[PDB]
Design a protein around this ligand. Sequence first.
Ligand SMILES: [Mn+2]
Ligand SMILES: [Mn+2]
Lengths: 430, 431
Amino acid sequence: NWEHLLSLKRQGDTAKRLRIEQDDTRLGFEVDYDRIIFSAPFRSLQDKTQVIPLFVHTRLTHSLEVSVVGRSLGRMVGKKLLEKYPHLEQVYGYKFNDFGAIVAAAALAHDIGNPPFGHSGEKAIGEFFKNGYGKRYKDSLTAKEYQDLIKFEGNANGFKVLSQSKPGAQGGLRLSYATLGAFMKYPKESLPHKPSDHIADKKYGFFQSERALFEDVAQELGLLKRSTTDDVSWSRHPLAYLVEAADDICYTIIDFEDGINLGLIPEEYALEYMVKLVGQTIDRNKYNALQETSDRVSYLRALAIGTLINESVDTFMKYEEEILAGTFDQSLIDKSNYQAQITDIINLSIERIYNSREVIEKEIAGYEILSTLLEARCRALDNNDTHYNQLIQQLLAPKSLYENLIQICAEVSTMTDGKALRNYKKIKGL
Amino acid sequence: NWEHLLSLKRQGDTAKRLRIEQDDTRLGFEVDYDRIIFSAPFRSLQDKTQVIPLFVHTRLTHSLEVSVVGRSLGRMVGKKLLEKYPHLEQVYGYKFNDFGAIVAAAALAHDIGNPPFGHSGEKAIGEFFKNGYGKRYKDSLTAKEYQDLIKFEGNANGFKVLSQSKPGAQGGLRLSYATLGAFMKYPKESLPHKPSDHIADKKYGFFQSERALFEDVAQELGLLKRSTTDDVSWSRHPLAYLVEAADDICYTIIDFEDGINLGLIPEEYALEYMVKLVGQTIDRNKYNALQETSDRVSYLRALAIGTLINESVDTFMKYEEEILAGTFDQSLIDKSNYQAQITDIINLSIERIYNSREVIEKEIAGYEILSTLLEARCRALDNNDTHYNQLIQQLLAPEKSLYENLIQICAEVSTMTDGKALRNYKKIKGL
Ligand SMILES: [Mn+2]
Ligand SMILES: [Mn+2]
């Protein structure tokens, strides 16, 4: 039910928060966005690389653009949802901007827990615990505690970042449960691993340390169960599909834009790859009058993103009842009439950007930087009495074993590119 | 006996050196100072870090300031000792500046054996032999030889630097035995480890390689034997307490000063922590007229050092007979009426300087630099036959026991300036 899915609950609440009694200048969903903007984890995205080493998008500007696309998706979907379910507005007091605000906030935070150097950063952390120094802990951990480490997931670390309790600050950012639900695109634990080909099963969305919190979130929202074993799993909050589409749209089109501006993709390819996405709306005489590459490609990007937003809204509304019943199996973009063109764009970016020598060099270096930092933290954990290990604790980190290891991963993951490289260089004498 | 404690003997001497027969213009104790100044090991302190990386004090300017403070301590104590025991001057010919000379020279040399990167430097060397590559030598060494390595001690390496013979240079710098006695603030071997809580038992002062040398020094000075087993130790030469006091006074107050001028310690802490130490001697009109932070804090530093020197002289004379009998169980500064203020100063320096990111980072890097140089030297020692290991020997060290080879490797890595250690390190790693 949408009334439950739009929960304003915050962690620890003892009483219900009715939408009709909200102060509209202090709307819980919009406070959520402001809390993320000013948070230390969001600010650190300023100094973190998205794909191409550091104009190129950093994590912060990527997340900003995704939240803008997400707000537009949520606004347009919210308006059609309120005309489909008019009791949501007439009885309960919901407004179209509420949906825009939920998606905008979840989208703003979607990459907040990701480690440096991208997917290699996650693999480097995983490999450290699978076959590196961290392997020795296996027998002291449950299967799921260990799986959290060997398949260390940035989405799950983001949920920890958003909700972590510390002295003086229980509940992290204390976001609305509707926002936490829109954030959670993999509502399952680390095991079982990929139980189906469904997008929501491709990874997992919370660590064992956050399991009890997401249990509270899922019951408050009324999310549908996807497992009746002790391995817990739920169907995605409907608005998580819009967070994912905003993200899909932005890195597809905007990585392409960056690749052209950086000279990694020949400009000769720009129209060829964008023509079907922009063909009906492009003012071609205007395009031909633009004198700078960056102006031409930003014009194409805006048209293609506009095309994909409108189509994504229609796809959501067309499958709304399957999404509400937890039986929708794909992403919104999987259903696009432009799936062939999106795939061509992504494949060109893989060939020209992700496999460029510079991106490869960064990923290889990132493996050495993260492995070194994890080994130093973990040896210091195992022997905190030696002089060297006390120095290491003082430089990098001034509980149960699992809690200690998952915290080490979270702290390594949240270091800025320059801070991780500086610490690595000092540990190695440079 | 003070007549034997003030020995002018140098290594290898075949005849006695009477104080009454010394040429005043070439006094043995004063020549010791000149020999240290011009030595290669002392010069190398130019380019060696004390706490903060490279105005900031280096090991050289620190050692210089300690020797000046030590010269005053020894002059003042020397005057009072000669009034207490007038026969030392009237019969034996000793003068109060002799005591200043002995303390000043020993204090000038007190950090001459210290490795680069501070006390993390020593710990990095010990860690190499405890848990690093050097652990493989444990079963080929005696317990005290291995302990020399895993608790590698800058003070013991200093004694090696000052005294060790080489072809054409028997006896090292050949300092007077009274000076070597005042240098030795831990007169014991590496084992047993901390047999008591007395400051003199905290560390050790000579390697096994130098045990026979200090036995000669201790016998000539008449130091009281403190241990009777095959584990040897002696009660400290009385003047070693003054060397230790001058060192304690300097790094306590001067590190604090440095930390304020670097911005690590807000200036307001200066007056607050040092008001007791300066209040009876400070000219407030002068203080209030000084316009620069660095001028205000250096004035407070001068006043606080002057206060602690005077007090330390008094403490020494109060416990002089217990020190002469080897029953004094503390440092002179441990007895200070300002121990509350000294402790506060040290704790803030630890928090704001020693634990600063800059120092932590430098110490962490030094561990890797020293471990790498040590491993290259030991691998080349273990397999001198390979082309690579011959290149390493040409680069870093262009017939003795395994223990003597390992102690020399440690001494030579310790001799390197910060810069030369980094360059050799970079070459080995190819940077
Ligand atoms: Mn993203
Ligand atoms: Mn010193």
